[PDB]
Design a protein around this ligand. Structure first.
Ligand code: MYN
Length: 483
């Protein structure tokens, strides 16, 4: 009957202890806390972008203007509004002003190919009003009278794992509030802190930096694109900007480790890197704490976008030098289960598919089919029927120090990741094959491309950036005669 039916008491007890995660957080809802910070700290810097710094007063003023504009053009609460994700100031007033309108923002990269932007507008139900006009130069205005309704939708963020099947994750306020409380409390975020935003706003780790900043009075510091590509300049930039909290995907951090081994760094202001996405190992994290002088602790996380950025966490020990780092214990009010093909809860030590429950779950996808294939109800213990999200990820429950912990084990469809983004090998093969003049193409991750045909690698470069996002156009494009 139940998913734990076959377990012995000791094995069922391990799972019960692991998911003993309930925590009640105080204060009003998320947006209200953001407004209280604007009242308490109007003169503090709230966002530091590439074209300037905005105080909390200016940020909420500009956001107010955005929300009044949206009301003036018939955008009622519960609508979805696109915002141009850039590294400038404008997008922050856009996304905040959308939220004050009682709406949800869908982040769009304006450099992305137009065909993919059109899909996202259509699938999100999103108006492009704020893509067509400059959100920061809208006429000043008070915010409109939007009542507070509980668990409103905050964002639709797109995950592009399946080719021709981008999925729009719909995320509501309780999940984002719960995440924000965790980030602030777990990492001791304070008004004087400076939170780096490495992820663009199209990638949900930006969420984990922006709202904990704005819910505390800390400063959100967006990491400029030219700085992120150069691991050396990035390390210098973290010191010059006195960043206290940073987000990275595992592969990006490995680059920083390489750049740190070549030129060891002092980062006295850094207290936290929240890092995750791919499996990594204690011999790497030991190497890091060797060439980096810093109080920064590494917080390894795991989580799909479908469960509000992060679902598990592990404080990474700097003494250990061997073995795989575990993804750790669930975030507050999260609950995770390792299930087999049959839906039975795996004994400790046995690899299963992660299903996620609790306060972090999306409402679902915009697509009904995708929602029905991934969210489901299961009675996992006697008397506990969970709404679950089926991740596609494998993990086992292990003993790590005094605690039960999950250890990541792979995927069921094991696709590759590039700069933290799940992508299929077969989409970049079809994209270069579809360039008229090119023929066969093989793409390997070393992202390198070998293709047959007489399109010089410059004209191919130009045709690919018009078709693919900037992160899927291969780093090398080598013309070859046969495969
Ligand atoms: N915080 C964090 N979470 C995950 C992310 N939500 C994802 O789906 O890739 C990996 C990178 N960083």
């Amino acid at each position: 009957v139940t998913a734990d039916a076959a377990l012995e008491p000791d094995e069922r007890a391990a799972w019960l202890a692991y998911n003993d995660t309930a925590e009640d957080f105080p204060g009003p809802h998320l947006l209200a806390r953001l407004d209280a910070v604007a009242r308490e700290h109007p003169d503090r810097p709230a966002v530091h972008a590439v074209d300037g710094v905005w105080t909390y007063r200016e940020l909420h003023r500009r956001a107010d203007a955005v929300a009044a504009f949206l009301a003036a053009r018939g955008v009622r609460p519960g609508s979805v509004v696109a915002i141009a994700a850039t590294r400038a100031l404008a997008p922050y007033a856009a996304l905040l002003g959308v939220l004050k309108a009682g709406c949800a923002y869908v982040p769009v990269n304006p450099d992305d190919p137009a065909d993919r932007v059109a899909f996202v507008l259509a699938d999100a139900g999103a108006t492009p009003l704020l893509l067509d006009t400059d959100p920061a130069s809208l006429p000043a205005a008070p915010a409109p009278d939007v009542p507070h309704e509980p668990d409103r939708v905050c964002y639709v963020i797109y995950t592009s794992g399946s080719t021709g099947r981008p999925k729009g994750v719909v995320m509501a306020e309780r999940a984002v509030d719960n995440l924000t409380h965790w980030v602030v409390r777990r990492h001791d975020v304070r008004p004087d802190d400076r939170l780096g935003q490495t992820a663009p706003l199209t990638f949900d780790p930006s969420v984990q930096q922006v709202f904990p900043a704005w819910a505390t009075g800390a400063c959100l510091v967006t990491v400029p694109d030219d700085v992120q590509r150069d691991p050396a300049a990035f390390l210098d930039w973290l010191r010059a900007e006195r960043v206290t909290h940073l987000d990275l995907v595992t592969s990006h951090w490995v680059h920083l480790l390489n750049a740190a081994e070549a030129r060891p760094a002092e980062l006295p202001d850094l207290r936290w890197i929240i890092i995750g996405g791919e499996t990594y190992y204690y011999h790497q994290t030991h190497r890091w704490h060797r060439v980096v002088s810093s109080p920064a602790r590494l917080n390894t996380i795991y989580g799909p976008t479908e469960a509000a950025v992060n679902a598990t966490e592990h404080l990474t020990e700097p003494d250990l030098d061997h073995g795989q780092v575990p993804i750790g214990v669930p975030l507050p009010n999260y609950r995770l289960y390792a299930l087999d093909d049959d839906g039975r809860l795996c004994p400790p030590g046995i690899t299963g598919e992660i299903h996620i429950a609790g306060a972090g779950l999306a409402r679902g996808y915009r697509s009904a089919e995708a929602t029905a294939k991934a969210f489901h109800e299961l009675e996992v213990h006697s008397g506990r029927t969970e709404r679950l999200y089926r991740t596609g990820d494998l993990a086992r429950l292990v003993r790590h120090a005094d605690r039960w912990a999950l250890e990541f084990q792979g995927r069921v469809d094991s696709q590759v990741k590039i700069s933290g983004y799940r992508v299929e090998l077969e989409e970049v093969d079809a994209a270069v094959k579809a360039v008229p003049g090119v023929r066969d193409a093989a793409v390997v991750v070393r992202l390198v491309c070998c293709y047959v045909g007489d399109v010089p690698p410059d004209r191919l470069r130009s045709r690919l950036t018009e078709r693919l996002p900037a992160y899927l156009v291969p780093h090398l494009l080598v013309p070859v005669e046969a495969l």
